[PDB]
Write a protein that binds this ligand. Structure first.
Ligand SMILES: [Zn+2]
Ligand SMILES: [Zn+2]
Ligand SMILES: [Zn+2]
Ligand SMILES: [Zn+2]
Ligand SMILES: [Zn+2]
Ligand SMILES: [Zn+2]
Lengths: 441, 441
């Protein structure tokens, strides 16, 4: 029945409002939110003889991380205490006589408060289940795998996960992405997803949304780690070690300056062999990666157009510029296409991470429309030729670009004696069907 | 009431082979005996009606039947009791000539009042064959010659409607059809030693050729040069066909060549090849009218002086199979990345079986021909490939450089030549292995 302190796992009679469990000493070293102490007041408040002592800065990295998660206090609901029953929700409240926990009874909700009216604040779930001792060691027992785009980190996970293992992943979407590279996996469809999830096949490794806390398994993995909420990572490292796959040079987490500090003190190894694009792309993105990248595939065509084009998937920075099937660059992390157009109509719109992702989505050809010459400032991606015939869909119509980017017909492509380049199944199926009809007409 | 298979007139008799004959045609089926007005077979001077001698028939059918000799069954005894016998349904020749043994909720449903009659069963060989309609229906059908790797089965997907039917000659061919189709109705055959998917019942049908005709809108014949001559006739007794095949690949088992009907149908040939290089295309071009064009890189040809075991090993004779090698005839419609042709026995290679063997692999073929059998049929020179092949041996991925030297994937990454595979399991190994080289070393 006794809680241990999340900073100093000594006995923890108290709790922050956010709410981490603190000991008698650490009540004055959590400047992130108030902590009510032995007297009815919060520490630091000059309200009496006990809350008079001043607060101090905390030495934990947890403190430094809360500096980017501002405390939004919820408003006081009031505590109407029966004989022992009260009409309130789950529990974990700070009244005025110390911490109070109301427990789920189906014969009413029971509290160990004598009959009266007490003003009560709900505790947040921000630092619940965080144990900074456990984190301190576990992080040193964990590993981080830098998978650049197209190095197949997401695949190495498959040739290593076993069915008693748990895979954590940050968003509903990345969750789904992982379900499908696995196939048979166990999971729960998140409350309030706006997507359609397969059937939870009940004989596979587990897949869980990072925000769900820790769940026991044998080995645990963190998918798209450099992107994950800092506090939910810590909630994991308070209970297990982790095998972390991600990339610092792509997108940062959505409410934070950079990636969580725990990855910076892990041992880090980086995949160097790339299965998705040509060496010219690899060379363009090399500055962001320590070890040399070696491309297993052909030169990816690079073309810089003067006026906008619509070849392949169109990627664009800002939502307002999306036309006719295009998508945001951010929404394309993890995705792969044969051909992308990089659509840059709006100025000061392309940050270095957003540029990385975009020039590494395509396999065979990228078309860059960069009137404000933004991309040259971050990546040296010179125009590059391929002596092949590109095949891509556009408005459900197979079109063919020759080695000089002229739209020609399937028939003319067979005439010019250059091979077709394409990987997408539907493109390749349209391509093979059409060549049949040409011969049988 | 039954018409005649030769002569669509009232057919009150029937050959031993299952073909309904009129009164005229009784004397013109030299393939097997048939019984007349009396109890005797014509020809046999053994009565007062069977004295006139037999005549040669003038249908192509008679000509086909010269290739399936009549094997007459040992005479069963038909125990007619209750009007029911304990023999299996069909047609028999008792005492009385024509007697039909039906389905029955009673069990058998026989006429011929009770007694115990020596019976002979008719075979199912010419059952439901109407040469009149065949004659008229061939001239309405079409034949698509699809050389190996022309993807004839792909053009078929792009034409078939849900009411259409697709016949196919073997269990294996049916499977491969079903998988290329996806959504398709079928019944798994009885006795199958293979693993069929679940018969999605919202698709075009897919039936086994020996399962006779079944209603449908448009019908199709798969690997038509390979199909049983008489089973094809059964189809042309009821509908027109669209036939996809290759006369220059295997013959139907137990026949000289393909069924004559394809010779009097219009024929067109696919010219575009998606499987092997133009070197292999040139090697087989004598067997095809129209020029073959390859859409893929050269295939390596290596003539070995010792037997090897690189890739999938093909060999003509069951006797020579060792360590997972497969006969050449088992490999029609299969595709591999690398094949080894294992030619250790003399006079083993007809022309069809070489055509098949040398058009199975995508990227490399190794020939072991110490009896120099192949040269007599196909000019298959040696050709080099500036690449590193990859293939499994015995659960172990081995790599061959551009000089056919086994190397390690480590060394492969060093010689700076791209890898060349397509098989999924091979490519996943290659990937997993390159991961482990940079991750654990
Ligand atoms: Zn403490
Ligand atoms: Zn706090
Ligand atoms: Zn106080
Ligand atoms: Zn007749
Ligand atoms: Zn017969
Ligand atoms: Zn007679």
């Amino acid at each position: 029945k006794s809680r241990m302190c999340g900073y100093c796992g000594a006995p923890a009679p108290y709790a922050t409002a956010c709410g981490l469990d603190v000991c008698v000493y650490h009540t004055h070293f959590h400047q992130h939110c108030p902590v009510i102490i032995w007297c009815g007041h919060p520490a630091g408040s000059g309200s009496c003889s006990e809350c008079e002592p001043p607060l101090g800065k905390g030495t934990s990295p947890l403190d430094e991380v809360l500096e980017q998660v501002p405390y939004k206090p919820p408003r006081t609901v009031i505590m109407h205490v029966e004989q022992g029953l009260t009409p309130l929700d789950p529990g974990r409240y700070q009244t005025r006589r110390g911490l109070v926990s109301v427990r789920r009874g189906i014969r009413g909700n029971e509290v160990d408060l004598p009959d009266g009216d007490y003003a009560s604040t709900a505790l947040l779930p921000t630092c619940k289940e965080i144990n900074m001792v456990a984190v301190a060691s576990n992080v040193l027992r964990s590993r981080f795998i830098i998978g650049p785009p197209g190095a197949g980190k997401t695949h190495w996970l498959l040739q290593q996960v076993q069915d008693g293992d748990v895979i954590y992943t940050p968003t509903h979407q990345t969750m789904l992405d992982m379900i499908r590279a696995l196939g048979t996996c166990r999971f729960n469809v998140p409350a309030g997803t706006t997507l359609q999830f397969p059937a939870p096949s009940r004989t596979g490794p587990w897949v869980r949304i990072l925000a769900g806390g820790w769940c026991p398994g044998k080995n645990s993995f963190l998918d798209e780690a450099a992107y994950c909420n800092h506090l939910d990572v810590l909630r994991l490292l308070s209970k297990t070690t982790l095998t972390c796959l991600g990339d610092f040079k792509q997108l940062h987490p959505v409410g934070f300056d950079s990636h969580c500090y725990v990855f910076d003190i892990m041992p880090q190894t980086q995949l160097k062999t790339i299965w998705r694009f040509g060496q010219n792309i690899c060379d363009a993105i090399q500055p962001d990666y320590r070890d040399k990248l070696m491309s297993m595939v052909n030169t990816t065509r690079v073309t810089h157009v003067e006026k906008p084009v619509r070849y392949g998937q169109v990627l664009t920075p800002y939502h307002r510029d999306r036309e006719d099937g295009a998508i945001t660059i951010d929404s394309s992390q993890g995705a792969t296409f044969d051909v992308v157009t990089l659509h840059l109509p709006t100025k000061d719109s392309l940050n270095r991470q957003r540029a990385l992702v975009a020039i590494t989505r395509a396999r065979h050809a990228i078309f860059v429309y960069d009137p404000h010459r933004q991309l040259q400032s971050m990546f040296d991606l010179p125009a590059k030729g391929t002596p092949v015939n590109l095949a891509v869909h556009r408005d459900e119509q197979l079109i063919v670009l020759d080695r000089n980017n002229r739209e020609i017909t399937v028939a003319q492509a067979l005439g010019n004696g250059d091979k077709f380049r394409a990987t997408d199944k539907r493109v390749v199926d349209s391509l093979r069907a059409i060549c049949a009809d040409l011969e049988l007409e």
